[PDB]
Nucleic acid binder design. Structure first.
Ligand SMILES: [Mg+2]
Ligand SMILES: [Mg+2]
Ligand SMILES: [Mg+2]
Ligand SMILES: [Mg+2]
Ligand SMILES: [Mg+2]
Ligand SMILES: [Mg+2]
Ligand SMILES: [Mg+2]
Ligand SMILES: [Mg+2]
Ligand SMILES: [Mg+2]
Ligand SMILES: [Mg+2]
Ligand SMILES: [Mg+2]
Ligand SMILES: [Mg+2]
Ligand SMILES: [Mg+2]
Ligand SMILES: [Mg+2]
Ligand SMILES: [Mg+2]
Lengths: 55, 88, 218, 100, 51, 129
RNA sequence: GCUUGAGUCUCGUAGAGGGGGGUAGAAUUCCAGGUGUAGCGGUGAAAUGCGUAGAGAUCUGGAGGAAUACCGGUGGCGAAGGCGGCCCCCUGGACGAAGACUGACGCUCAGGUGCGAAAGCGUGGGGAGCAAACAGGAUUAGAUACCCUGGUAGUCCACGCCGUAAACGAUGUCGACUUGGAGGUUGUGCCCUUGAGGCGUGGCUUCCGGAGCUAACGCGUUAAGUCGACCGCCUGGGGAGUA
């Protein structure tokens, strides 16, 4: 959310597969769903999080 | 988009005091300043059409202002175009 | 000045803009009417009501909703006044001459309920013709005897009485109505602000109308 | 002078280069009179997916305030140095401390 | 996707696959490209989900 | 734009009136007033007021008679695009005689009736009825 | 002269706004290899095609181009065209809170200039998938098609052309005025912040609906309502956007 390093908070905004969870489920606000995804994206690149559950 | 440092500078170089921000000359001057800076931005790139639109915008504005001045104080006009270095 | 123990106002969003001048509400996402404006409208309400009621009151207490209906089959019903307390058969004012025969049937039937033919025919026909009666009975009570043309009309909830008011508006029948915050006024010549569907504002002004038609010239 | 996160991650085998690397970057940035507001040698962390063959690799966090210029001549060195399997330099918006 | 199911049973129980992929992003990516036409598909897919 | 302000006045009446609006205000001007004057003197507006000083504020009270408004129609005539100037023999009389025509003259904003008597003419600002 | 129109200045906010450089994982195709063995592929059914020089399937490594799942949404930006992975660099616009400066410096704009999807053209380059042309197999009375197997240009990059689209809201721009309701989005002021809020106050937007307007459909404070300033354009169908 407020940051990608927080993989802690994060891991509960992604499905098992690692797909970013729709806001209609997280029930999250708008502005933040973006800050969220952006930080998730950010965290996948630094291998702090999977893209895929195939690993 | 021009440095608060640099924009201020020019306000204190063309107006009564700083704060005299809206003084004709001052506008005409910090437009000029950007217009010129920018000419290198668009020196590279050139395909940055969109940004170019603001730059054209800049020119046509400063142009209108320059015009109005000449209409009012033709003195402050000549002084300005000399000292801003344009109108050839 | 108030009397209304509790009709205060009523009705929340659904407000009809034109009902501004009779509202000062705001409590908990619903507006309270102008408590002190409903009142100077009993001045004129019951006044030109009783005013025509002495010169001879023939009213028509039009009001419906399976939860307020029968509470009009009273001193509203009884005294110098007539009533409709069910689905307002459209055109019953406007087709009065068609429906006029829907009366002849009602009578020519009950006038033959405990009268005339009855316990004869089949033990089918029986309540298998009082299914006819019970029907025409409600919706077409206050019609029965008309005697003196419908002359003003007292109507309960202006918009929920879309038709009957409109009918009147057409026929020159002054329409006295109470109009919630949500209901559309101006169809009403004599407009009565305030709640329209709480068991009180009804009986109150309702019974209070009966209580001024009922007496005006001794 | 602007800020950046920066969080290059190095190759296990070249682990004991990480101290010299940090010494070096700090030197370079400090020399430009730019400060340095956080530093975290997370060491050998386990990878989510197995980037570049090899799982688990040595992370290092930074947080610096330096002129868009030395930050420029950083990703270069970050490229040159095939011991750094990824890097990333980020936003800014004023300094930072602890978290993580 | 994955179920490493455990001790005493034999039933499939894989109701998971109708929770993401399968004919989800699969009947999708299968065929006609689309392009600007999804826009039209997903525009009618909101006009519906209003009421 | 703001280029014709009198049509803006004419319309703020026209509109608010059809909105059954009690008052209505607008930036004032010498001109504006002299007209509202006539509107009042001839009984179309209830009463005006200019509550300002640096940023003047012409303000008018609309009347409603029966259920209607008193202004059954208020159109501009002259306008910055096309200015109208009728002599005197040519001055236009609205609704036969009822209703008025606001006309500016070498001596002030008067009504066609008035101007006709005055013996002069000028720019026929607008029509009212 | 004036300060309300219009600009300038200060701090900030949101953003697939533009241009440039990096870079990431998922897949497809291809190359190499391990294992494995008689089919695979495809359709409505088939056949062309592919496989015992071992295909498909399965695992492993590698090369290459192209596009960026999930976020994602009557969500967001732009003058229109249009713009979706991540990061840095350069840069345009918008909006908001304050207050300060300019002092009508404005609106519109024939001519003019710029921009302007996709296709198409010029030179080099690049080429995985898709695919005009073209080949082959089918269907069919016929099949120069729709379906199948292949597949060239093109689709990709750089520079330069072309200047058109149902380039559409089929609604020119600017300004003023005129009842409502439920959202979405994005600033900001105030309240024991003591509720994840509570009451306001701008920008933008979706649905619905009043007067009114309309041939009707419908529009409806984002007008197709009430008005003004300017500009483009229409005058029966065909002929013709042709000579
Ligand atoms: Mg004037
Ligand atoms: Mg791959
Ligand atoms: Mg492979
Ligand atoms: Mg910007
Ligand atoms: Mg071009
Ligand atoms: Mg092209
Ligand atoms: Mg080419
Ligand atoms: Mg084909
Ligand atoms: Mg054309
Ligand atoms: Mg459209
Ligand atoms: Mg257009
Ligand atoms: Mg609304
Ligand atoms: Mg609508
Ligand atoms: Mg209009
Ligand atoms: Mg031609």
């Amino acid at each position: 959310e407020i940051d990608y390093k927080d993989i802690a908070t994060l891991k509960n905004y992604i499905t098992e597969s690692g797909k970013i969870v729709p806001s209609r489920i997280t029930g999250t606000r708008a502005k933040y769903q973006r800050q969220l995804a952006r930080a998730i994206k950010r965290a996948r690149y630094l291998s702090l999080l999977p893209y895929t559950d195939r690993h | 988009s021009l440095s608060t440092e640099a924009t201020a500078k020019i306000v204190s170089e063309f107006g009564r005091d700083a704060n005299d921000t809206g003084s004709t000359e001052v506008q005409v001057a910090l437009l000029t300043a950007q217009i010129n800076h920018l000419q290198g931005h668009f020196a590279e790139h050139k395909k940055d059409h969109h940004s170019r639109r603001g730059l054209l915008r800049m020119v046509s504005q400063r142009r209108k202002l320059l015009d109005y001045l000449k209409r009012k104080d033709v003195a402050r006009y000549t002084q300005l175009i000399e000292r801003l270095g344009l109108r050839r | 000045m108030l009397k209304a123990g509790v009709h205060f106002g009523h009705q929340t969003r659904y407000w009809n803009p034109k009902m501004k001048p009779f509202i000062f509400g705001a409590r908990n996402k619903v507006h309270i009417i102008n408590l002190e404006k409903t009142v100077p409208m009993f001045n004129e309400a019951l006044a030109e009501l009783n005013k025509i009621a002495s010169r001879k009151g023939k009213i028509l207490f039009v009001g419906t909703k399976r939860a307020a209906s029968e509470a009009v089959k009273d001193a509203a019903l009884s005294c110098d006044q007539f009533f409709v307390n069910h689905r307002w058969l459209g055109g019953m004012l406007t087709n009065w001459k068609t429906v006029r025969q829907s009366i002849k049937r009602l009578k020519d039937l009950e006038t033959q309920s405990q009268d005339g033919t009855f316990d004869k025919l089949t033990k089918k026909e029986a309540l298998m013709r009082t299914r006819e009666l019970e029907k025409l009975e409600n919706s077409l009570g206050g019609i029965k005897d008309m005697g003196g043309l419908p002359d003003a009309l007292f109507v309960i909830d202006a918009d929920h009485e879309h038709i009957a008011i409109k009918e009147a508006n057409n026929l020159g029948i002054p329409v006295f109505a109470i109009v919630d915050t949500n209901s559309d006024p101006d169809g009403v010549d004599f407009v009565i602000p305030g709640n329209d569907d709480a068991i009180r504002a009804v009986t109150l002004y309702l019974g209070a109308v009966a209580a001024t038609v009922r007496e005006g010239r001794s | 002078m602007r800020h950046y996160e920066i969080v290059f991650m190095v190759h296990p085998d070249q682990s004991e280069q990480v101290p010299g690397m940090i010494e070096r970057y700090t030197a370079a940035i400090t020399g430009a009179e730019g400060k340095i507001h956080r530093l975290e040698d997370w060491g050998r962390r386990q990878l989510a997916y197995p980037i570049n063959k090899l799982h688990k690799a040595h992370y290092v966090l930074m947080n610096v305030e330096a002129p868009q210029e030395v930050i420029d001549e950083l990703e270069t060195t970050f490229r040159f140095n095939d011991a750094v399997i990824r890097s990333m330099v980020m936003r800014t918006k004023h300094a930072v401390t602890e978290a993580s | 996707i994955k179920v490493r199911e455990n001790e005493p049973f034999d039933v499939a129980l894989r109701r998971f696959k109708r929770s993401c992929e399968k004919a989800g992003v699969l009947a999708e990516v299968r065929r006609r490209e689309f392009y600007e036409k999804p826009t039209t598909e997903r525009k009618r897919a909101k006009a519906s989900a209003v009421k | 734009s703001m280029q014709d302000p009198i049509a803006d006045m004419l319309t703020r009446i026209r509109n608010g009136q059809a909105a059954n609006k009690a008052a209505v205000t607008m930036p004032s001007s010498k001109l504006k007033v002299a007209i509202a004057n006539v509107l009042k003197e001839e009984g179309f507006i209830e009463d005006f007021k200019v509550e300002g000083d640096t940023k003047p504020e012409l303000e008018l009270t609309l009347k409603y008679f029966q259920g209607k408004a008193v202004v059954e129609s208020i159109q501009r005539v002259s306008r910055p695009g096309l200015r109208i100037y009728k002599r005197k023999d040519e001055l236009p009389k609205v609704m036969a005689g009822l209703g008025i025509a606001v006309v500016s003259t070498s001596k002030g904003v008067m009504t066609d009736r008035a101007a006709r008597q005055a013996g002069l003419g000028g720019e026929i600002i607008c029509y009212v009825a």
